[PDB]
Amino acid sequence: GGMEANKNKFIEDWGTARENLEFNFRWTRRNLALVGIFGIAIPVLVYKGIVREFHMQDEDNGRPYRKFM
Amino acid sequence: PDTIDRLIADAEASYNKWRHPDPYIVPWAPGGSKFTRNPAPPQGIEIVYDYGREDN
Amino acid sequence: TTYKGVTIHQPKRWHTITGKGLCAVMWFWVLYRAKQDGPVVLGWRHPWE
Amino acid sequence: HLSKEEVIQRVLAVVKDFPKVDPSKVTPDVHFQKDLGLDSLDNVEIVMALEEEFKLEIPDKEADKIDSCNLAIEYIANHPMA
Amino acid sequence: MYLLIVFLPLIGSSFAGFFGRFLGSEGSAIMTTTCVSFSSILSLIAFYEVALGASACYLRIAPWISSEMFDASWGFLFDSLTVVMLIVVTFISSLVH
Amino acid sequence: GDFRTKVWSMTGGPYCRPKHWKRNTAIAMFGVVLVCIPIAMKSAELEQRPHHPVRPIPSQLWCKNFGTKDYE
Amino acid sequence: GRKKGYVEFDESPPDDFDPANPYKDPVAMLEMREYIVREKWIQIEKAKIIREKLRWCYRIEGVNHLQKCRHLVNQYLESTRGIGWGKDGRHPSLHAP
Amino acid sequence: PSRWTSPGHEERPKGYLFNRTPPPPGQSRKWEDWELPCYITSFLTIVILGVGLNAKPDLTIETWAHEKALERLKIEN
Amino acid sequence: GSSKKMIATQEEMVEARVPLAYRDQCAHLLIPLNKCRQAEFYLPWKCENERHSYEKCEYELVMERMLQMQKIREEQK
Amino acid sequence: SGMGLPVGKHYIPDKPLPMNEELLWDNGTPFPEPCIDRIADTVGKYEALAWLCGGLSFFASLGLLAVWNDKASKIPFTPKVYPYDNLRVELGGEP
Amino acid sequence: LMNHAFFKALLFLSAGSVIHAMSDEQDMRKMGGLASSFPFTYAMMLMGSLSLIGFPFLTGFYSKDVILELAYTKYTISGNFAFWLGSVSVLFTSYYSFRSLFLTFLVPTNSFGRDILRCHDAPIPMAIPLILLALGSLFVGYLAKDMMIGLGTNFWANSLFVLPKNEILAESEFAAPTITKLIPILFSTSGA
């Protein structure tokens, strides 16, 4: 039956603006800082911590530290 | 009226400073403990039978 | 009973009896236990005395 | 639901129990400023007393709109939680 | 008895939630309350047996998660502490029902 | 409500009072009695009590796995 | 079609397998891997049996379970020394010979 | 009018299952085209799964290694 | 140490299943008390003589330790 | 327990929505509030943080006072010694 | 834990009875003067509140007092911290429980006249749980004291394990001075 939602123009515009955020990127200072912190620095720190955990396991086992990329 | 308006603004600020952290609200009033507990059904709502069928 | 314009019905007899009796049981239990284990709690004498 | 006659009687009792009000000249269709002579603050005090008696909460705009007995009875009778 | 203790609330809850249209507001309440009450009675009997009899009941049905040594299971440990908690939970549940 | 009477829900709905709720509740009692029998028998089969109780206990009537377990 | 439902494997390493060059013969490599898997599973099941008898010792013996089941605790803890395939996070004090 | 004595007001649960309009009295609803194949394949799935899984021999490596470990422990002890 | 010889032996303490934390010099008096507690459903008014004897023994032990520590403190000062 | 008043008509947007309206935990009622609500609107977030830090600092100061008390240094009874080598075998020592 | 389950369920059930009778008021600022109109419910609230405070020889007297004694006797930094905070918490608990009792039942009426007229005490199926919970909050603490918290009881069997060097129950019982035993009562009455 006639079950279609009563579409609101402003709600639809909000949805389209949300799904079209790729046009609004401008490499501003905030965007650059966020990319450099949460896109590079945090993954690098996580990788270093994981490698450190593996190397600590190697030291406790007495083996020779493993080789990672 | 200008000094009246400034007095009103100062009184509003003073009230906002010293208002009760959790003022009493009637339970069914907006913001009470009974607000929207068991509301009456909204009007103009229709339930449709036999929605999806292979043939009409 | 009504005083100015407001009447308040008496609470039910079983309500009053139950509440009063259970509180009386509580107070009598407290008094009996205080008599029995008063000095022990207050340090007057050990239980094996 | 609460009867309109009882609403009228309780509102009239609230209005009559006022210092600056002559109890004789209180009628379901009087105006606070005009007939029985009260200012705005007495009106909002009377509205607060009506709220306290009837166990209901009015938004501030409608509380200001309540400025006479007839309005008070009309609002309280229209409210379903009276 | 002990699986009855554990699963009596489940049976009543499932029946009242899958056939609540037939039991109604009163029938479902009666059913859930009587299931919890029988669970509490069996819990008191279990208290006698375990705590007051210095016994201990152990149960196991299925491995559930079974790996090389991930030894999960659908077991039931009935110690004095477990039985005390059983009484507390079941009695409070019946009174709350 | 006005439209809630046309909505089928598993757990009755708002203010569910069927005409034969007494008969339905009796049938539910019988169903509980029926479903609890296999559970009770499985309980009696699967229970293990390594320690003999100090006093005679109700579980001694049906459960027989009393003191039949050893760690060897 | 299968003859009967019980597993038939050989408890011996496959022949023509060179430890120096395990990758020379693919069939020998795969059969040796399967045999190693079977041996590891046998060790795991032995540890599981020891664990089961340990748990039943702990259940049967009450407060005095620290001295009656000490031998079983030691046996289980030495039996779980080389069970795993990738349990390198387990401390060498409990997972290394 | 006690709640525990008076019979319920409604003769039928409110609404209809699957929001299906009931057929006229003395008639049975017409089944959908998918209903027969779906029900036959569901019953066949249930019977095949149950019978096959219960009748399947327990030839798992876990049980085989358990038996072998028991034999080895008995030999060692 | 203590000024009371341990009457109860390891074998009878283990057989009676005395709790580990209470395997002290008063265990020989605790053993009958625990049997009485089991026999009388741990009621707080049934086992009086045994409970009083065990509590007196425990109080004697605690007083011995208090005297020892008081002597230690006097020697320190 | 008991039927209440109708909730009323919700808010139909008539102006462009903010780009974070999903952070508005709106019911079907005309009284929506954000998914994150500050219980004490009178005080600022930093003032509340300062007060909470003061309370936690009071807890830490009381802990430091307990450390400075050195109650273990004023124990009135010597440590209890159990018979049979301090229950070595019973606790799990090598027999 | 068991004693708290009992008397706290009692408090919640009694407060729910008050709220249900008062048309779901739930606010103590508009709840005064209900002692006369709620005899049985007020009696239940009083019994539960006294148990929660730990009035002598109730179900809360046999649980929290021993906890405080053990906290005092645990001669450690953590023990001292716990003893201080437990004593002050006993004081505050007495204060707020008696404040709730006064505001809900004994303070002169502050509620609206609408709720006062139609207030009815708890019916039979709301009173049967209350009576059982009151009996429990009276006698559970006394009956289960020797069963659970007794001196060297084998009741727990192997369910609970305590190291021989960590048992201080007898030490507290026979070492705690009388003043430190009686601190909770004095703090409770000061808070009241």
UniProtKB/TrEMBL annotation, chain C:
Protein name from the UniProt record: NADH dehydrogenase [ubiquinone] 1 beta subcomplex subunit 2
Cellular component aspect of the GO annotation: mitochondrial inner membrane; respiratory chain complex I
Top-rank taxon, per record: Eukaryota
Section of the entire sequence shown: 8 to 56 of 66
From TrEMBL, chain D:
UniProt subcellular location: Mitochondrion
Keywords noted in UniProt: Electron transport, Fatty acid biosynthesis, Fatty acid metabolism, Lipid biosynthesis, Lipid metabolism, Mitochondrion, Phosphopantetheine, Phosphoprotein, Respiratory chain, Transit peptide, Transport
Keyword Cell membrane carried by entry: no
Molecular-function annotations in GO: acyl binding; acyl carrier activity
Pathway in which the depicted protein is active: Lipid metabolism; fatty acid biosynthesis
Broad class of where this protein is predominantly found: mitochondrion
GO cellular component: mitochondrion
Keyword Lipid biosynthesis: yes
Domain Carrier: 5-80
Signal peptide extent: none
Function: Carrier of the growing fatty acid chain in fatty acid biosynthesis. May be involved in the synthesis of short and medium chain fatty acids. Accessory and non-catalytic subunit of the mitochondrial membrane respiratory chain NADH dehydrogenase (Complex I), which functions in the transfer of electrons from NADH to the respiratory chain.
Similarity comment text for this entry: Belongs to the acyl carrier protein (ACP) family.
Subunit structure: Complex I is composed of at least 49 different subunits.
Protein's name in the database: Acyl carrier protein
Protein's organism: Phaseolus angularis (Azuki bean)
UniProtKB/TrEMBL annotation, chain G:
GO cellular component: mitochondrial inner membrane
Topology relative to the membrane: Peripheral membrane protein
Intracellular or extracellular location(s): Mitochondrion inner membrane
Biased composition (Acidic residues): 8-18
Stretches the record annotates as Disordered: 1-22, 82-97
Main location group: mitochondrion
The entry's keywords: Electron transport, Membrane, Mitochondrion, Mitochondrion inner membrane, Respiratory chain, Transport
Paired cysteines (S-S): C57-C69
Database matches in InterPro entries: NDUFB10 (IPR039993)
Protein name: NADH dehydrogenase [ubiquinone] 1 beta subcomplex subunit 10-B
Gene: LOC106774903
TrEMBL record, chain J:
Transmembrane segments: 48-68
Keyword terms, alphabetized: Membrane, Transmembrane, Transmembrane helix
This protein's record includes keyword Membrane: yes
Protein name: NADH dehydrogenase [ubiquinone] 1 beta subcomplex subunit 8, mitochondrial
Species this chain originates from: Vigna radiata var. radiata (Mung bean)
